[PDB]
Amino acid sequence: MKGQETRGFQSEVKQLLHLMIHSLYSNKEIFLRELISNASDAADKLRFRALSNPDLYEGDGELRVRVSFDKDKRTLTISDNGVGMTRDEVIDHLGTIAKSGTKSFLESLGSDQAKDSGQFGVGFYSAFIVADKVTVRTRAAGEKPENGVFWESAGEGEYTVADITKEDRGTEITLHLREGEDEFLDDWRVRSIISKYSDHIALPVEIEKREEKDGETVISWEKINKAQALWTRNKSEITDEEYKEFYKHIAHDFNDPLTWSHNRVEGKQEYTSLLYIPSQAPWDMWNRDHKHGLKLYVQRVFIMDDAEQFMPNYLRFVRGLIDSSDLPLNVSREILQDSTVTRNLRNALTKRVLQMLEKLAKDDAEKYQTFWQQFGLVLKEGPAEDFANQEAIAKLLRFASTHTDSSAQTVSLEDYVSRMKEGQEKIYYITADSYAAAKSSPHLELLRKKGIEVLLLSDRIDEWMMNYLTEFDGKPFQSVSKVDESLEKLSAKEAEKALTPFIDRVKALLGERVKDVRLTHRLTDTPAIVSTDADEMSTQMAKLFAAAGQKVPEVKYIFELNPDHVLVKRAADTEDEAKFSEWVELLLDQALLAERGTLEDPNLFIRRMNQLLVS
Amino acid sequence: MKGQETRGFQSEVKQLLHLMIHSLYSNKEIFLRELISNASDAADKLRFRALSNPDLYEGDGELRVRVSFDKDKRTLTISDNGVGMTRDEVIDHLGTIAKSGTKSFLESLGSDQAKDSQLIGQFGVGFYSAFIVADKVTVRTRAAGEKPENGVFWESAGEGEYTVADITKEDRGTEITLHLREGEDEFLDDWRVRSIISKYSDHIALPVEIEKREEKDGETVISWEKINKAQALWTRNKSEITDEEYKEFYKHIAHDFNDPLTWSHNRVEGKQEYTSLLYIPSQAPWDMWNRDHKHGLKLYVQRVFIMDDAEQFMPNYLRFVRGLIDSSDLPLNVSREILQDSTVTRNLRNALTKRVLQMLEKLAKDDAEKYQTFWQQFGLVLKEGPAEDFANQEAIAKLLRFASTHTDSSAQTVSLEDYVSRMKEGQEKIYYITADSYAAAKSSPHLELLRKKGIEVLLLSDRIDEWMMNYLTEFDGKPFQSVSKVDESLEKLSAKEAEKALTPFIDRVKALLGERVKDVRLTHRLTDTPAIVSTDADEMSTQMAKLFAAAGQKVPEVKYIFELNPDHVLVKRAADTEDEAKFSEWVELLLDQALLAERGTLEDPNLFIRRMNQLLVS
Ligand SMILES: Nc1ncnc2c1ncn2[C@@H]1O[C@@H](COP(=O)(O)OP(=O)(O)O)[C@@H](O)[C@H]1O
Ligand SMILES: Nc1ncnc2c1ncn2[C@@H]1O[C@@H](COP(=O)(O)OP(=O)(O)O)[C@@H](O)[C@H]1O
């Protein structure tokens, strides 16, 4: 009680209050609606101020208003851990009364309504309709605990204000009840009153429950809005069917979910989250910015159907709903996109989703396959679009490769390294327009012969993904379509040779069309085969430019020939200039079609071969 | 004045009105705001009722409220072609007074406010405001739909008694004639009235027109002048705007910075009523090919903004069209939902689609240079049209453009007209090839004969073409046929000297292959291609199969018809060889050879090659 002060006005102010407050005499019970409300606005206000300077919570997350009693000293004590008032605030609000109150009262005065008639609303001072001493202790978030404020009043023209201390933020309204009004010590009656409000109110209202049992008299706090909330009953009450049914409902889909993660986070930010992974990518999947899924609730209340915001694009299949508290109701997409809390909440959830997937892949690779069937093409965005997890994503990735004679893709990157052979340092992949070309490329035949596992990438986004996905578990990625100096020496030497003459003859004949001509011990039954390395525009990269419809960039190709194949030698020998020309030409076109895939003239190659057969 | 009747309900009602109406005495001018408003709600109400039963307009589109005078009989006549009242309506509204008026007046009564001073300028009376400056209000009105004889008359002195009578007026709406009071000559000044009304007109919903006369050209004219002018670059008619002005505009309302290739800006009076301005961009933006999101059309209502961007007034195959349409008589407050419930949408859409297509046709008459740039940018979209909007499949197909034999540039510039134009005598059909790429098209086996005789063939290389054709059936009397399907029309179409017949050969291939090819034949598709494979017979065509492939379903079985060229080396040379293994190798090489040239993306270039390998090795 330091710095005490009585501010203590007069005359028929003393009277005026014994007027208005008494006007409410018909529906006294109002004073609850009014006080409970104030406690709401308190919290939500604090919530909002905590979108920013995070430490405004001082740790304690749960915001609640608690109604307690004393059938002894006959007190009814409403208290909230809201934002609370400072000293000035106190004296300027509690100090005065209710601007809207007096106002609508005054302009009401003297009208038939006014004179001959419960129609009204005073404010905070409503309390004095059932109290004869209102005693406020409070301290406002942020302020050192010593900056508390005391406010007693008789509900006349004079109140007392004093600096106190309380090591626990919020507002403690202690009503000293009047003779007669014992009706408001019935924790029931209070309950039943407040219940009508609590479906507009913004806050947990907890009521003191003194129930005696075991001989020992316990006091619980009973939240009077239990909340019909299938994402509230913890993971040990719910049926797998219950979950399934739920997702069904809030998805307008009717297949079962493949899996779900439903958790509850206390602490920094505070929220109950439930997420599903569907089994059937809907229609909209690959259209529009419209991403749906996440329903955002605030305080077990509905805000918006659907924010794409708490989900990164490469998981825009995730359905479900997150239910925040400590996110201020009234929030909307804009407001979120201005706060940081969004950034954080997003990231956390992304973790939760990825985990949920990892586990699905441990526990039911049957179902999980069905997942990757449905969504893999989306998850393959991930690596380009959230480096912070490029690991825990890549694991989730799945591929088709050499050691699997099936279009379907089921190869884990783990499953790759696992059955890697001793000494093998790199992870090899081919990138073609189609599974076909992949499985059956010239670049394949050696590795496929030695048995080495090659990866079969047939989706256009792959030619994208790789550029970012660099290296898994210590083993970097390399591509068969790019002849390296590592495989350049993999066993083959007993009796060498040299077939220079016509290779310089091919070099001369072609000119700049191919950047180089060589032999290569890529001893596939394939005669000729064309590559490009040297940090130049790779072949599918070109096709990618084609596919986004820009000028297909020039390819610097490296013609390679197979010294151990019929047609290689047989053309190599012929000494007719016209015939030979026809032959090396047939060989190149042959290799081209096998690389550039969609050969921009299958006829032309054919026609050259036609003549080579005709004449 | 048929069926006349004087009703009145009395007492200190006669007095009560000389109370409230007189409460407004401070700001008499109010009676304008009030009447003008009523005329607004009138129109907009009618507008809304005309989202449905279309004929509610009786033709006449422009909705306006007109203030006229008479410095003679001292009348001020406000009139609207709004929705108007029926008889019951009259007696139930005009008949009584003002519910909100009396109400807020009553609960006001006896309070300090009420008592003192000119606070009496608080208790807002309604229609009856008129009697604050009138001493005789005379209403003639008839409500949309009702036969013109169901008009209603309503005179009143502004006491407790009004007269109502059935009259007739062959012109919908509400005619409020105020008989002005001694003193209040202030409201015959067409100016003062104007200047008053101007403050309102920025919330009002309607054209307010004032009677503006001048003895000019010797003669005294009466022009109706509108109060607001509207800063509206789509209002000044086509004879008051700069090509730069237009260009700048599109730029702005597109967030694009290239110039438009063309525009159509017109004004429709009549059934539905609206000023439309549309542009054809020069650069298809990013979003072009993937969004449940069209943009472009900005919908204004009464020179007011409604929504940025509707996709209901444009069909998909023109979703590049940018611009804005400005309806009147589309009821403001309308939104996508409401439109998609009305029919007016259906109609408005269709009309615009016409206007767009026309705008294009003309572009193709008057600057084929630019138009090419158009088709470069948007053709792939316009090629949806034929499958989408049968009602114009003509005026679309003309706009279509292709590459064909009688050019050898990848670029496509051939009008269908340009095709038939240089068709040869007797040639009845229009031929096309459908390949994965310009290459294959230009250089297909099916080509070489037609290309030799000189006959123009169409080179379709985009995947949607294999779609479009199925619907685009026949242009200007000449049906479409495809080279990839050997018909019995070209089957008989030059220099045939020595003739005979092979049979051991053809039947030996038939036996060797079995069911793999449905038939084996010769064909005078004579040219430097040996073997070539087709199918006809109303069976699954080749690209149709590829289309199933491309939507990723089980690639349906193709019933192929092997054909051979009796006049080519390799044809004969394999034909003669009598070794069973060698010959097998040869007919096999011939088939694989033809396959790759049809099925294009040959699902094993190696396999064909390997067969040829052996045919060269051993
Ligand atoms: N539990 C509370 N926590 C923080 N401020 C409160 C609390 N209860 C009342 N207040 C403050 O007092 C109110 C304003 O005072 P006033 O305008 O005089 O009307 P009244 O005091 O009746 O609500 C609220 O606006 C709020 O700022
Ligand atoms: N020009 C008008 N056209 C159609 N109805 C009108 C017109 N002017 C007044 N009304 C009708 O009369 C009004 C209702 O009457 P009422 O409730 O007694 O108040 P007031 O007559 O003063 O507007 C409007 O709601 C409207 O329906």
Per-residue HEC secondary structure of A454-467 comes to EEEECCCCHHHHCC
- The single-letter DSSP state of residue A256 is P
| Domain extents in chain A | 1-224, 239-397, 398-615
**CB of B260 within 8 A of CB of B282?**
yes
User: Which of A283, A526, A606, A609 is best to mutate for the B interface (most B CBs within 10 A)?
Assistant: A606
End-to-end CA distance of chain A: 116
- Among chain B residues, CA nearest to A290: B292
| Helix residue ranges, H only, A419-560 | 435-439, 445-450, 462-465, 500-510, 539-547
Minimal Cβ distance to A601: which of B290, B439, B530: B439
Length of chain A in terms of residues written = 615
- Inspect the interface and report whether the beta carbons of A598 and B601 lie closer than 8 Å: yes
**How far is A315 from A373, CA to CA, in rounded Å?**
15
| Bridge-based pairing state of the strands B262-268 and B305-307 | unpaired
**CB of A557 within 8 A of CB of A534?**
no
**CB of A532 within 8 A of CB of A443?**
no
Q: Give chain A positions within 8 Å (CB) of B107.
A: 111-113
Residue identifier of the C-alpha nearest atom 13 of ligand 2: B93
Say if domain A1-224 classifies as CATH 3.30.565.10: yes
Handedness of CA B234, B236, B238, B242 (dihedral sign): negative
List the beta bridge partners of residue B301: B327
Kindly give, in sequence order, each residue whose CB lies less than 8 Å from that of residue A320, ignoring residues fewer than 6 positions away: A247, A250, A260, A273, A274, A275, A276, A293, A294, A295
**How far is B20 from B23, CA to CA, in rounded Å?**
5
Q: Provide the 3-class DSSP secondary structure of residue B260.
A: coil
- Nearest residue to B603 via CA among A436, A73, A540, A154: A436
The residues after which chain B has a C–N gap greater than 2.5 Å are: 493
**φ and ψ at B50, to 5 degrees?**
-100, -5
Q: Provide the 3-class DSSP secondary structure of residue A263.
A: strand
- Nearest residue to B297 via CA among B286, B289, B308, B283: B308
- Nearest residue to B169 via CA among B143, B202, B135, B131: B143
Q: Which ligand is nearest to the CA of B44?
A: 2
**How far is B220 from A565, CA to CA, in rounded Å?**
105
Q: Which ligand is nearest to the CA of A172?
A: 1
Q: Which class for B211: exposed (0-12), middle (13-18), buried (19 or more C-beta within 10 A)? A: middle
CA angle A125, A131, A132 (to 5 degrees): 100
Neighbours of A252 (CB within 10 A): 9
**How far is A84 from A57, CA to CA, in rounded Å?**
12
Integer CA distances (angstroms), B99 to A20, A89, A92, A332, B127, in order: 31, 44, 41, 39, 11
- The single-letter DSSP state of residue A420 is P
Integer CA distances (angstroms), A607 to A583, A589, B235, in order: 12, 11, 63
Structure tokens at A62: 């749960």
A221 residue type, one letter: W
| Bridge-based pairing state of the strands A65-70 and A158-164 | unpaired
Question: Does ligand 1 come within 6 angstroms of the Cβ of A389?
Answer: no
Kindly give, in sequence order, each residue whose CB lies less than 8 Å from that of residue A246, ignoring residues fewer than 6 positions away: A230
For the stretch B493-498, contacts whose Cβ atoms lie closer than 8 Å and that sit 24 or more positions apart, written own/partner, are: B493/B453, B494/B453, B496/B524
Instruction: Kindly give the interhelix angle for B99-108 and B11-23, rounded to the nearest 10 degrees.
Output: 80
CA angle A295, A298, A300 (to 5 degrees): 90
- Inspect the interface and report whether the beta carbons of A566 and B617 lie closer than 8 Å: yes
Structure tokens at A267: 């602490």
Kindly give, in sequence order, each residue whose CB lies less than 8 Å from that of residue A283, ignoring residues fewer than 6 positions away: none
Residue identifier of the C-alpha nearest atom 12 of ligand 1: A93
**How far is B172 from B93, CA to CA, in rounded Å?**
19
Kindly give, in sequence order, each residue whose CB lies less than 8 Å from that of residue A357, ignoring residues fewer than 6 positions away: A259, A277, A368, A371, A396
- CA–centroid distance for A579 within its chain: 65
**How far is B450 from B429, CA to CA, in rounded Å?**
12
> From the CA of B183, how many Å to the nearest CA of chain A?
36
In what side-by-side order are the strands of the sheet with A471-472? A400-401, A454-457, A427-431, A475-479, A471-472
Instruction: Kindly give the interhelix angle for B344-366 and B368-382, rounded to the nearest 10 degrees.
Output: 140
Integer CA distances (angstroms), B85 to B42, B91, B140, in order: 9, 10, 10
Burial code (b: 16+ CB inside 10 Å, e: under 16) for B156-178 equals bbbebebbbbebebeebbbbbbb
For tokens 């009348």, what's the residue?
B75
**How far is A491 from A449, CA to CA, in rounded Å?**
13
**How far is A46 from A170, CA to CA, in rounded Å?**
10
Minimal Cβ distance to A602: which of B108, B440, B604: B440
- Nearest residue to A223 via CA among A201, A241, A238, A207: A207
Length of chain B in terms of residues written = 618
List the beta bridge partners of residue A112: none
- Nearest residue to A560 via CA among A529, A526, A581, A591: A529
Kindly give, in sequence order, each residue whose CB lies less than 8 Å from that of residue A219, ignoring residues fewer than 6 positions away: A208, A209, A210
- CA–centroid distance for A20 within its chain: 52
What is the CATH number assigned to the segment(s) A239-397? 3.30.230.80
Structure tokens at B461: 């290389």
- Nearest residue to B36 via CA among B165, B171, B197: B197
B450 residue type, one letter: L
Query: Where does residue B565 fall: left (phi above 0), alpha (psi -120 to 50 degrees), or beta otherwise?
Result: beta
Record: fold of B242-400? Ribosomal Protein S5; domain 2 (3.30.230)
Domains A1-224 and A239-397 are alike in CATH topology: no
Secondary element (H or E) of residue B511: helix B504-513
- CA–centroid distance for B554 within its chain: 38
Q: Provide the 3-class DSSP secondary structure of residue B189.
A: coil
Q: Provide the 3-class DSSP secondary structure of residue B588.
A: helix
Q: Provide the 3-class DSSP secondary structure of residue B153.
A: strand
**CB of B381 within 8 A of CB of B319?**
yes
**φ and ψ at B314, to 5 degrees?**
-145, 130
Handedness of CA B406, B412, B415, B420 (dihedral sign): positive
In what side-by-side order are the strands of the sheet with B173-180? B6-8, B161-167, B151-156, B134-142, B173-180, B75-80, B65-70, B208-216, B219-226
Neighbours of A332 (CB within 10 A): 11
- Inspect the interface and report whether the beta carbons of B606 and A288 lie closer than 8 Å: no
Q: Give chain B positions within 8 Å (CB) of A600.
A: 437-439
Question: Does ligand 2 come within 6 angstroms of the Cβ of B93?
Answer: yes
Handedness of CA B234, B239, B240, B242 (dihedral sign): positive
What CATH homologous superfamily does B1-227 map to? Answer: Histidine kinase-like ATPase, C-terminal domain (3.30.565.10)
Handedness of CA A504, A510, A513, A514 (dihedral sign): negative
**φ and ψ at B66, to 5 degrees?**
-115, 125
Minimal Cβ distance to A603: which of B108, B110, B597: B597
Rounded (10°) CA dihedral B251, B255, B261, B262? -60
Q: Provide the 3-class DSSP secondary structure of residue B345.
A: helix
For residue A318, the number of C-alpha atoms closer than 13 Å in the C-beta half-sphere is: 31
Computed over its alpha carbons, how large is the radius of gyration of chain A? 39
- The single-letter DSSP state of residue A257 is P
For tokens 């610097």, what's the residue?
A556
- Nearest residue to B449 via CA among B467, B469, B431: B431
